[PDB]
Design a protein around this ligand. Structure first.
Ligand SMILES: Nc1nc2c(ncn2[C@@H]2O[C@H](COP(=O)(O)OP(=O)(O)OP(=O)(O)O)[C@@H](O)[C@H]2O)c(=O)[nH]1
Lengths: 453, 85
């Protein structure tokens, strides 16, 4: 049931996190920044599997199965120059359309619609270079308007172009916005398509990112690159279940089976202990923690990568993947303690799920204090809170219609009325999504199938 | 070569009959030959590797390969297999 997955870099943040993720994967699989595997191709026995994400043209070279898409050629050229020969130049899309004319979602949607033929041709060509394919992993960067529009365009193309492929998505939300109206509008327009077509979506609120980067790093000033490093390490840890396949979860579809209770609830809440492959990772051997402490930290709000807003939060699918030399008795003890310390909906007796991963034989081994790490993903309704304030912005700005002269160009509708209607429809869609999420927080949700048969 | 060596050894130990030298030569012979068989089996036959392969194949120790075979032959398994060439 295991298939290959292709990475999709959309927007400047998307391209940066893709660069960081591919550098992290090259570090784990000893591939480096040159595209040539740092290990000699004479050792055929490899416990990992680069094939789902690396195409192998020459025996020592593994080309990352990813496409670089952006409107700003400067960042693409920079990433290509840093990663000499690592990426494929034919998979770098810029459309030569110049810089983005603003941060409007409509601009990105238009630049994706006009150049849809080229990107679809590139995607089909990449599919031709593979045989067993399962789905894509899209990086939205919804904080940017052009990036969000491009992501929505790719989603609207791939939903009907490949309905038999599972499409997971990664939306990065900012903490504070200089003009909350424009970014809120872009995120709402992207979330509309996320609810419509996206099969799986992982949110990334930048507030917890800034907090963690200020806590674990020594420098008080926070740089965007090592912040994207967090998301890249997260994506590598989650993909470890396929790159370093375990004995329980061996396919992204199987992973989403225990994480997607229904196509409606497809937004997850992440959490991760203090990382070890980041820049300032020397202050990790002084923690002296165990696997039970790792699980506690995974359940702690200080290690969640999104705005917690924990006011008796309802969980739906709590799962975790633990990488390192893990002990089963500590796992059982942690499960016992957490089942006594986690709110569960009374209509479902399904508890949290624990998975154990393996460490790479070429990754730098850490001391016995932080030698084992873990990632946690919990289906929580509090994610809509991240949108709630956003909708609040909508609910307090849509009465007038500011910045309307910028979403009228590019899209198919130049009139104010049609754009207003589309925004009202997107607001209604996100309202219905929040209503579904708040109804899932009740037992009457499951009782709906009991009252009628 | 082992037979020739320990035969010369026992020939040197023939005048004693039943002695402790006989027993210690037997013990050295057993230890050496057992270590040698273990080495030969782990190198030329990959004993522990064979055990790992059997655990991953028959005991389904490798979920990835099992899922691969399942997605490969699900069409044939779903169809009746009364006649299998
Ligand atoms: N944390 C973090 N956020 C980023 C980073 N790069 C971009 N972003 C987010 O993206 C928003 C700015 O938009 P861009 O990513 O540049 O998208 P754009 O404006 O269309 O520009 P291009 O993507 O180059 O076309 C900011 O509000 C950030 O939240 C990054 O490196 N780290």
């Amino acid at each position: 049931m295991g298939g290959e997955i292709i990475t999709l870099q959309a927007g400047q943040c998307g391209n940066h996190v893709g660069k960081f993720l591919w550098s992290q994967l090259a570090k784990e699989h000893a591939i480096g920044t040159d595209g040539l595997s740092q290990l000699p191709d004479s050792s055929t026995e490899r416990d990992d599997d680069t094939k789902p994400f690396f195409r192998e043209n020459s025996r020592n070279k593994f080309t990352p199965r990813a496409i670089m898409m952006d409107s700003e050629p400067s960042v693409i050229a920079d990433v290509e120059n840093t990663f000499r020969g690592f990426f494929d130049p034919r998979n770098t899309w810029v459309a030569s359309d110049g810089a983005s004319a603003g941060n409007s979602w409509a601009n990105g949607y238009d630049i994706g619609t006009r150049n849809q033929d080229d990107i679809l041709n590139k995607i089909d060509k990449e599919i031709d270079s593979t045989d067993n394919f399962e789905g894509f992993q899209l990086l939205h960067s919804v904080a940017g308007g052009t990036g969000s529009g491009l992501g929505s365009n790719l989603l609207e193309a791939l939903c009907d172009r490949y309905p038999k492929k599972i499409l997971t998505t990664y939306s990065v939300f900012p903490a504070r916005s200089s003009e909350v109206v424009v970014q809120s509008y872009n995120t709402i327009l992207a979330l509309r398509r996320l609810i419509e077509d996206s099969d799986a979506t992982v949110v990334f609120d930048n507030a917890s990112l800034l907090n963690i980067s200020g806590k674990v790093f020594r420098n008080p000033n926070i740089d965007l690159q090592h912040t994207n490093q967090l998301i890249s390490t997260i994506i590598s840890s989650v993909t470890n279940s396929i790159r370093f396949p375990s004995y329980m979860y061996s396919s992204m579809s199987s992973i989403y089976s225990t994480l997607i209770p229904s196509p409606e609830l497809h937004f997850l809440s992440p959490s991760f202990t203090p990382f070890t492959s980041d820049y300032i990772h020397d202050d990790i051997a002084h923690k002296g923690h165990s696997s039970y402490d790792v699980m506690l930290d995974l359940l702690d709000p200080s290690n969640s990568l999104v705005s917690t807003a924990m006011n008796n939060p309802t969980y739906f699918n709590v799962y975790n993947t633990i990488i390192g030399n893990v002990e089963p008795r500590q796992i059982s003890r942690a499960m016992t303690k957490l089942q006594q310390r986690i709110k569960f909906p009374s209509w479902s007796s399904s508890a949290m799920h624990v998975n154990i991963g393996r460490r790479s034989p070429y990754l730098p081994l850490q001391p016995n204090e932080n030698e084992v790490s873990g990632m946690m993903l919990s289906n929580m309704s509090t994610v809509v809170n991240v949108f709630e304030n956003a909708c609040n912005t909508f609910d307090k700005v849509f009465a007038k219609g500011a910045f309307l002269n910028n979403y009228n160009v590019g899209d198919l509708f130049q009139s104010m009325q049609n754009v207003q209607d589309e925004f009202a429809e997107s607001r209604e869609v996100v309202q219905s999504l929040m209503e579904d999420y708040v109804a899932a927080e009740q037992d009457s949700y499951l009782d709906d199938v009991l009252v009628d048969d | 070569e082992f037979s020739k060596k320990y035969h010369v050894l026992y020939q040197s130990n023939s005048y004693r009959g039943i002695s402790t030298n006989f027993f210690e030569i037997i013990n050295d012979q057993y230890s050496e030959i057992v270590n040698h068989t273990n080495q030969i089996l782990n190198q030329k036959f990959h004993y522990r590797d064979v055990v790992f392969a059997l655990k991953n194949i028959l005991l389904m120790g490798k979920s990835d390969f099992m899922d691969a075979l399942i997605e490969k032959a699900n069409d044939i398994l779903a169809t009746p297999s009364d006649s299998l060439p």
